[PDB]
Amino acid sequence: MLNAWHLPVPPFVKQSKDQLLITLWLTGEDPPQRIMLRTEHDNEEMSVPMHKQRSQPQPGVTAWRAAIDLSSGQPRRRYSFKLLWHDRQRWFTPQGFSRMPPARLEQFAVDVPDIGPQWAADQIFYQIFPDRFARSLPREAEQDHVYYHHAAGQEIILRDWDEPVTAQAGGSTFYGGDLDGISEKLPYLKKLGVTALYLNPVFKAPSVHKYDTEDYRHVDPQFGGDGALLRLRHNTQQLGMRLVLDGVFNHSGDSHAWFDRHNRGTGGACHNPESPWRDWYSFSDDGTALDWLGYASLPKLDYQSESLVNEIYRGEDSIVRHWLKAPWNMDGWRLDVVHMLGEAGGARNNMQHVAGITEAAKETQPEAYIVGEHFGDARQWLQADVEDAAMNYRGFTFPLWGFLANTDISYDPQQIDAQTCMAWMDNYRAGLSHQQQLRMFNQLDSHDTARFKTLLGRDIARLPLAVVWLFTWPGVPCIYYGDEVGLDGKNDPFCRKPFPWQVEKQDTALFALYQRMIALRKKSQALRHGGCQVLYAEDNVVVFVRVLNQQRVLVAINRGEACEVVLPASPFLNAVQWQCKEGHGQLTDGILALPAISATVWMN
Amino acid sequence: MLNAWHLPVPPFVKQSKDQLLITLWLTGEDPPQRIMLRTEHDNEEMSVPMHKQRSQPQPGVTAWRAAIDLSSGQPRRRYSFKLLWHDRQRWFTPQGFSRMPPARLEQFAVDVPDIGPQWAADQIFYQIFPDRFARSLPREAEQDHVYYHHAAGQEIILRDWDEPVTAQAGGSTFYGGDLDGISEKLPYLKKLGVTALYLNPVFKAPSVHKYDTEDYRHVDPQFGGDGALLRLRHNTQQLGMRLVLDGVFNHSGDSHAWFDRHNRGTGGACHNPESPWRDWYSFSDDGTALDWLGYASLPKLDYQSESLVNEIYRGEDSIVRHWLKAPWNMDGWRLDVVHMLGEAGGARNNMQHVAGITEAAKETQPEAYIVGEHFGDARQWLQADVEDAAMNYRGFTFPLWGFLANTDISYDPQQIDAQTCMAWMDNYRAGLSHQQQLRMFNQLDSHDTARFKTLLGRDIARLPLAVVWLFTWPGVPCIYYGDEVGLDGKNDPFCRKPFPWQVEKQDTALFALYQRMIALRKKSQALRHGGCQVLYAEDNVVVFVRVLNQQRVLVAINRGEACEVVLPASPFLNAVQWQCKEGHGQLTDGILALPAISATVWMN
Structure with missing residues (x-):
């Protein structure tokens, strides 16, 4: 039977002067008489006649070749193949053969003028929640002082590393990890093979997760200080590593001086109407403020305010550009609820402010890497290019939850096969250009999920396959702390267990696995x-x-x-x-x- | 055998105070034990417990229902069905049952509240090509003058209706229609059943197709005039019809004030490099300017110029807001080549501008209708809301062209069956919200395509089917002048034949069918x-x-x-x-x- 094959890579895709070269393979009976190349001359679907080539690349299979003039037009190089017979018409696409013309998203693509994080196309990422990883040994008195989490209405529970994770006081319990414990564990990773860290919020806040931001310009004392971070920044720089932080620009915390809710200080938008930032936060007639999903702990941010947009990203000292310029030069930003940051306490012109930030970053750090937290279809945040990458929860993780663990993003039954899965995967990816596929944030679990191992339930034996798949799938893969060492846990607050550093706790069998696929991935251009x-x-x-x-x-x-x-x-x-x-x-x-x-x- | 049914209009999708209430039908063995309704509150996919209904709509009918809060969330609410059993899971979407979780922009979707032209679905449309529709008996003084078509290198050719249309002198052969000839044949249409006119390029132009606009601020002397465009408006306004104007906005004409590629103007950007309009176009280094698909007569315009951007849309008496205000009160626009509008003589920030002109067209005419010329997939733009609707070439016309005519967009070789076709059509719909599906601008051929009748070839027999389809499939119909009376043609120089007014030449059988369909459509809520x-x-x-x-x-x-x-x-x-x-x-x-x-x- 006739079969055709094409991938958006060099074997086929070869740059020469101002002409990109897309090539296709044909192997079978009743070959087409002509082949066309439907590309987008500057948003205008066209068609270019492909040439047959005397020279046969591998035997019994012919190769057909055409151009895309690159000297003019947009950078996304979208295209597909029109195989022509005299009466028949069959289309060849990423998703394969088709009879009905495909969609613009569902087609091979390339970012010829690629101006995105090229680094991070060859990286392993390691995710850490600073309070559950590593407690430093010389501890400033301010790293163990007990404080009141007004948000939860209880004082924080300081605990000894070996104490159990309780259901109570979930967001308020602290074991005391710090950027000095990661700057102390800079060797452990290097040997494991990690090449870059994803850093949860490290700015002053009251919770253990520090997503109720209280200032965007300074690092929490418990987590450390602008001191603990200047270190992890400079010390990683030598070792080759990369560092991306967690921001929350969708909301701050009810304790931030911006929307103070506890009258603990002064200037707050909650119980004071003429606050200079009363339009920076949304309140209804009843005057209560607009919080993220009913968590009074998280005041919503209204980016209609021209001033907010200066503090967040536009103005020269924006919070965005701030952590991205001298003396930090951080390697980029992670977007918290990126599909929720908008105006009038809603997603009004969301793509406007999302797109906005990533511009500001790009004038600071042209090479910076920006990731969207999309638990569902995230296509357009990225079809639009408001982001360099998107945490691939839909394309990679959840697809492996159904296949290997038999469950979905809401922990219900989910029966799928390999065929169903590979379609689901191949479909989403088809919406992204190759250079887009390569920067994806494909991981397996996170602090927003149970530990993957604990989800597999009675099939725990499958965990390997998952860790073997994790490093061969296209994109940048990541490893949430505790996973390499075979850690466990159900959803929060139990997916946030303290790390075991006593070898008598690690499943080093697992740990080997990472290293190999870690090294082999680095040895592989492929x-x-x-x-x-x-x-x-x-x-x-x-x-x-x-x-x-x-x-x-x-x-x-x-x-x-x-x-x-x-x-x-x-x-x-x-x-x-x-x-x-x-x-x-x-x-x-x-x-x-x-x-x-x-x-x-x-x-x- | 388990099966289910749901469509986004009442009885299922029924508004209730501050809550839209969604229902689903089910037939078959093994009913599912639980059902959850996945909605999007600000790009947030959540879950809404469905309850079965005590009163079963019909015999062999089980019904499940749940609520969608309208006091918050964004206007167009996407939703879909997640059926749960104890071990498997099934998803129900437009395109039916499926195992994969549904794409975001293929989920069921409803605009509540609605923003766009509601009266839109109610129209039936007549698309008029002035110089080839109706010549007013009382000709004007200069309405019959002949000039030099520099663009063609010949004088323009005057001709009378019954002459055969020639291939050569394509942009120069003039038969003599005007805006008054349209006004006087308004009897002919009100009989046909039409309720609104689509009026093809009507602003000053030396060609016949009027895409080389040469004064955006006046109506051409050979195509009617300012007074004649305010008469045809007076009639439609009284008769009760709606008149939509064409916005040739990706470019200007090369003989226009702003470019003056002829040495018969002043300040023109061609041969004066310092002219305040040099940045209104992008040029290359050999002096060449960016010409629309190499046709020097339509230089493309560089939208990175704020100067232009007030002239075209942002500015108060911008060319867009001019004709949507007194004295003209047009009912909206048709953006010829709207996809390639952007900066650096290309599509840089295309969507930014398209929404800008469509935004300028509403700010003046709050109930405006804005339609873009899309020969291909318009989906992403429509999901942005940057167009209320678009010529639905790939969403209606082409699906039909494959089945009924067995032809594609640029090549005839094409065979499809009913199943292959129908998925194509459901697909494009899934990506479109209902409030937009009814606003999609269904037609069967036009001034840029071959006449449907001549496409049908030896199978003219099927023309009836298609005509039914045009008025019965969701969306607004736009009967292109001629096909009702069985007019023929073949390409851009042959598909604009002068309307034949001699009863003996019209296939009146065809005309009948329209009338019925038009009326049937007018009587039916459905x-x-x-x-x-x-x-x-x-x-x-x-x-x-x-x-x-x-x-x-x-x-x-x-x-x-x-x-x-x-x-x-x-x-x-x-x-x-x-x-x-x-x-x-x-x-x-x-x-x-x-x-x-x-x-x-x-x-x-």
Whole structure:
């Protein structure tokens, strides 16, 4: 049968002068007479005649080649292939063959004038909640003084690292980790192979999670000070590492001097109407203020105020540009409820202010990396390019919750197969250009979820496969602290367990795994900046290959008993050297040999 | 066998005080134990417990209902169905049952409150090409003068209606219609049933197509005039019709004041580099300016110039707000090539500007209708709200062109069946909110395409089907002058034939069909404001039903040999008297008898 193949990578996609080169493969009976290239000359769907080539790239398969003039027009290079017969018309797309013309999002793409974080196309990220990771040894008296969380109406519970995580006082209990404990654990990671840290809020606030911001310009004493951070910034800089912080620009805390709610100080918008920032926060007729999802702890921010927009991002000393310029030069920003930051306490002109910030950043740090917290379809925040990347909860994580753990984002039953999954994945990704696929924030769990291991329930044996998949899927992968060491926990406040540093607690078996796929990913041009074409997905087996100029990397997942599979022939499976790297399976003349519950990896 | 039914209009989607109340129908074995309703409060996907209903709408009907708070949240509310059992999970969306969680912009969607032109779905449209529609008997003094079409390098050619339209001298052959000739044939239309006019380029231009606007502030002397455009308005206003003007806004004409590519103007940006209008266009280094698809006559305009931006839309007497104010009170615009409007002679910040002109058109005419010329996917723009609607070429016309004519957008080679077609149509709808689906500007061909009749080739037989479709599928129809009287043509120089007024040349049979359809559409709540669900999709047959509260309307086409059909049962299929309004299919209890090339229709 006729089959065609194309990936948005160099083998095909090769830049020469002001002409990008898109190439396609054709292998089968009744070939088309002509092929066209439907691209977007500056938002105008056109069609360019592709040429057949005397020279055959691999035998029995012909290659067809055309141009996209790059000297003019927008940077996103969108395109697709129109195969023509005399009576028949079949379309070839990322999502594969089609008979009905596809959508603009669902098509191969490339950011030829890529001006986005190019770094972070080859990184592993490590997520840490500073209060549950590492307690430093010389502790300033201000890091253990007990204070009152007015928000919760109780004083904070200082605890000894080894005390249990209780249901009570969830957001108020403190073990005492600090940026001095991460600046103390800068070696542990380097050896593990982490290359970049994602840092939860480290600005003055009352909670243990510090999302009820109280000032955006200074670091909490409990977390440390502008002192603890100047260190973790400078000390990481040497070791190659990268540092991105957590911001909350959708809301501050009812204790911020901006919207004081406890009369603990002065100037607050809550119980004082002529506050200079009374229009910076929204209040109804009844006068109570607009808080995030009924948490009185989190006053909503109204960006209609021209002044707010100066404090947050526009003005030269904006909170955004602030942590991104001298003396910090932080590596970028994480967006808290990025799809909720708007005006009149709603998402009014949300894309306006989201788009806004990322401009401001980009005048400060042209190379800075900006991530959206989208638990659902996040396509357009990114179709629009208001962000460099989006925490890939939809495209990567939740898809593995259904397949491997049999559950969804709301912890209900979810029965899917490999076929359903690989479609779901391939579909979302299809909406993103290749250079867009590569910067995604694909992780497996986080402080907003249970620990992944604890979700798998009775299939805990599958955790590997998940950690094997995590490093071969396109994008930037991340590791929430405690995961590499086989940590556990249900949802908050139990997914925030203190780290065990006594080897008698770690599952070092796991820890090895990271390192290998961590190193192998760094050894691989393929698994970092390479395309991906799903090769087999049905029932309980999954198979794909990352690909660049000559490097190829196959994978095979099985969520079932061991088995064999017939990889339909493919030009990707004719590599010169099937050098096994990971797993315990063997590829023998196109038949795949998998142990049960396997996650295998080949390479050249 | 489990199955479910829902469409975004009442009885299901029914407003109630400060709460929209959503309901879902269910038939089949193994009913699900719980159902949750996923809505978006400010881009936040939550869950709304559905309760089953005590009073079962019909026999074999279980119904579940829940609430959507309107006191907050954003206008267009997206929603979808998550059916839960104890172990599997099913999602219900427009496109039906599915296993994947639904895309955000494919979920059911309702605008409450509504913003755009509501009276829009109520219209039927007549699209007029002035110089080739109606020549007013009392010709003006200069209405018959001939000049030098520099753009063409020849003098413009004067001609009378019955002359054959020639290929050569495409932009120069003039037959003599005007705005008064339109006004005097308003009898002809009010008979046809039309309620609003789409008036193609009508501002001063030396060509015939008037895309090279040469004075945006006056009506051309050969196409009517300021007084004539205020007469045709006076009539429509009294007769009760609506007149929408065309906004040729991505570019100006190369003989226009602002560019003066001819040495017959002053200050023109072509051969005067310091002219205050140099930044109104982008140029290259060989002096070349950015010309619209290489046609020097329409230099593209550089929208990064604030100077232009007040002239076109932001400014008070901007060209946009001018004709939407006294004295002209136009009812809105049609933005020819609206997608390529942007900065650096390209689409840089395209969506920013499109919304700007559409925003300037409302601020003046709060009830304005703004429509963009989109030959392809307009989805992302429509999800932005930057256009109330658009020429629905890919959302109606082309789907139909594949099925009924077996042709594409640039190539004839194309074969589809009813199922392939119908998904295409449901897809594009899913991405569109209902308040917009009814506002989508359905037509079958136009001044930039080949005449439908000539596309049909040897299968002219099906023209009836299509005509039914045009008025019965959701959205507003726009009968392009000519096709009602069976006018022919082929391309941009042949698809604008002069309207034939001789009864003996008109296919009056065709005219009849329109009238009926137009009237049927005018009588029905359904065909204007009501939901639509395809009920059967196979090969040559398509069966669909528009629905509202109690009113129903069946339709059924068969572009092939006649046959019988096994109509799947449905809760809409208990109509009290399906009184045949058109077609010679007769319906016997869910068995449908469809004659060949039939366009049958019922109603109750």
